[PDB]
């Protein structure tokens, strides 16, 4: 955990599209982690 991005204001299309349109491993990791969390947790 070091120098990350605040993805607490993204949308389903953004993450999904960004992951399907982008290739930034970093984002992909943070995008997947936030995507899951949102499902697992709720705060």
């Amino acid at each position: 955990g070091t120098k990350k991005y605040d993805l607490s204001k993204w949308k389903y299309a953004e993450l999904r599209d960004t992951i399907n349109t982008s290739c930034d491993i970093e984002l992909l990791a943070a995008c997947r982690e936030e995507f899951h969390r949102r499902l697992k947790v709720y705060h």
């Binding site: 999904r16 992951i19 349109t21 982008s22 290739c23 992909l28 990791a29 997947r32 995507f35």
Partner: protein, 76 residues
Amino acid sequence: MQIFVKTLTGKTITLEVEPSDTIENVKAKIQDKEGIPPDQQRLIFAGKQLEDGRTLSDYNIQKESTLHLVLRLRGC
């Protein structure tokens, strides 16, 4: 040919294939290695999402190519 597959954490995977090999075929191989189902797989070669109905030749993916593996999340 021998292509590499970089994971999220950093774990790389080397797989022997041919320019004709179909992306879907590669995904299947990875599934036999790790445990990520095809529907839950997505190959990205530098801002380039590979289709499941194409070949490693339809992307100029030569040898020693690093393929970014991403877990295809759900949707609809």
